[PDB]
Amino acid sequence: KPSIVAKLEALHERHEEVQALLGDAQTIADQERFRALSREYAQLSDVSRCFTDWQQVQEDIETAQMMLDDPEMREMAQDELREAKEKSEQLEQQLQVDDERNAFLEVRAGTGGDEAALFAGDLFRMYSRYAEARRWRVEIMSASEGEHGGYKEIIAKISGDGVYGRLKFESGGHRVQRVPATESQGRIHTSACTVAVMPELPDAELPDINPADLRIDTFRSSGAGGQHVNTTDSAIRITHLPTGIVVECQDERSQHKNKAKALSVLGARIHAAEMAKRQQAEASTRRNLLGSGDRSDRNRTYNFPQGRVTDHRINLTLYRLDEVMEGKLDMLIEPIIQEHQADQLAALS
């Protein structure tokens, strides 16, 4: 706990400050601020209480050691084991606490070409094994095989309870440094892959053709029709008040046919506009989440010569790459979530 202790110290200080801020009757006159402070106080108080208990236990551990004579092993051992247990309880309790919906996982090659495909296949196998040893379900929707090895792009759907809340930190770039299979000599090569995780969201579409927000104009058509085209209102025009689209029809001699045709065309135009809006929003979100595989923008690195996996977002290096490549990356995602939660409490101003 090298850096998270600083965050918890700042959290405790802010908890004390907001505790003091509630007893002056000058910030209680307004109601929105009072309610905001009241909502802010709860989590701060709980986490601060647990952290103060941990800090006092640690300070006790620091003392009662720099002496001799008595066999101080037993009390030190019991104190440190209870400290570790309390620390584990604290981290879990402020890490858990919504958002547990299914997810879409897609990985594609970056720098490297025929070996980035192999690394993408390996990474997908890792994620699949992780999902399988969680009672989740993974099914492949789109696959583009990569000539020599794995996939140039794989898009699959993972379904379960708690999916997105744990796989939302894998979106980014993953760098691998190792000896490729497609290598005549014995050179080491650096390549990258890009991963995107996106939550599952519905597709609620409604017939927005409520006639209470439509303007209908009926008038005379223009063309060659004799003495009947003159004295008849056969042309129709519908204006949609919310969106502002206008559709005019004077195809056939019957007003009802024109009305039906123009209403259908207006509905089709509204549907197309809405679908285009959703598509562009999703495309922009995916572009920002994905990045650009260039072995220089990355979230984690895998070194096979040294067998080391490192995470640059929290600056955490570990030497258990063989377990990680076997779907045991729960020892990688938990430290991130913790650091992702202390900020959420700290971002309450």
Partner 1 sequence: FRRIRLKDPLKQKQLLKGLVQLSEEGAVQVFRPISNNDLIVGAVGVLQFDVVVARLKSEYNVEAVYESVNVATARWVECADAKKFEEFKRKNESQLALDGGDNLAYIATSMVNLRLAQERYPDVQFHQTR
Partner 2 sequence: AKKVQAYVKLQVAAGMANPSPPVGPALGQQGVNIMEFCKAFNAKTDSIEKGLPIPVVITVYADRSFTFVTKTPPAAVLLKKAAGIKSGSGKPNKDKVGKISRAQLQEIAQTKAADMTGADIEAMTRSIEGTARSMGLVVED
Partner RNA sequence: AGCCAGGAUGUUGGCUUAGAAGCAGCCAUCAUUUAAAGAAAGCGUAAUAGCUCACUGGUCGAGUCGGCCUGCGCGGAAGAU
Rule CB under 5 A: which residues touch Mg ion? 231-232
Cα separation, 54 vs 48, in Å, equals: 10
d(CA 282, CA 128): 24
117 and 149 Cβ atoms separated by less than 8 Å? yes
Does 347 bind partner 1 (CB under 8 A)? Our answer is: no
Nearest distance from C-beta of residue 345 to partner 2, angstroms: 17
Q: Does residue 78 touch partner 2 according to CB under 8 A?
A: no
Residue that is written with structure tokens 């551990």 in the block = 61
Q: Residue 48 Cβ, how far from RNA at the closest point, in Å? A: 16
Query: Residue 314 is encoded by which pair of tokens?
Result: 């929290």
**Residues after which the chain is discontinuous, using a C–N cutoff of 2.5 Å:** 97
- Distances in Å between the Cα of 9 and the Cα atoms of 3, 50, 63, 68 are 10, 12, 21, 33
Is the Cβ of residue 25 or residue 206 nearer to partner 2 in the bound state?
25
**Interacting residue with partner 1 among 16, 75, 80, 322 (CB under 8 A):** 16
Whole-angstrom Cα distance, residue 280 to residue 4?
Answer: 38
31 binds, among partner 2, Mg ion, RNA, none (CB under 5 to 8 A by kind): RNA
Q: Which is nearer to partner 1, 76 or 346 (CB)?
A: 346
Q: Is 246 helix (H, G, I), strand (E, B) or coil?
A: strand
Residue 70 touching partner 1 (CB under 8 A): no
- Give strand ranges (E) for the chain: 103-109, 137-145, 151-159, 172-178, 189-199, 214-219, 235-240, 246-249, 300-303, 308-311, 316-318
Q: What is the Cα Rg of the chain in Å?
A: 31
Q: How far is the CB of 31 from RNA (least distance, A)?
A: 5
Q: Is 32 among the residues that bind partner 2 (CB under 8 A)?
A: no
The helix or strand, by DSSP H or E, that contains position 297, with its residue range, turns out to be none
Residue 70 phi, psi dihedral angles, 5° rounding: -75, 150
| Smallest gap from residue 24 Cβ to partner 1 (A) | 6
Determine, following the binding rule CB under 8 A, whether residue 38 of this chain makes contact with partner 2: yes
The one of RNA, partner 1, partner 2, none whose footprint includes residue 25, by CB under 5 to 8 A per kind, is partner 2
Burial of 26 (0-12, 13-18, 19+ CB in 10 A): exposed
Closer by beta carbon to Mg ion, 232 or else 239: 232
Per partner kind, with CB cut-offs from 5 to 8 A, the member of RNA, partner 1, partner 2, none near residue 71 is none
Stretch of 17-25, 144-152, 279-287, 305-313 lying at the interface with partner 1 (CB under 8 A): 17-25
* Residue 35: CB minimum distance to partner 1, A: 18
The yes or no reply on residue 5 touching partner 2 (CB under 8 A) is: no
Does 20 bind partner 1 (CB under 8 A)? Our answer is: yes
Q: Binding of partner 2 at residue 348 (CB under 8 A)?
A: no
**Residues within the interface to RNA (CB under 7 A):** 31, 35, 38-39, 41-42
Q: For residue 121, give the 3-state DSSP assignment.
A: helix
Q: Which is nearer to Mg ion, 202 or 226 (CB)?
A: 226
Contact residues toward partner 2 (CB under 8 A) are 19, 22-25, 28-29, 34, 38, 41, 45
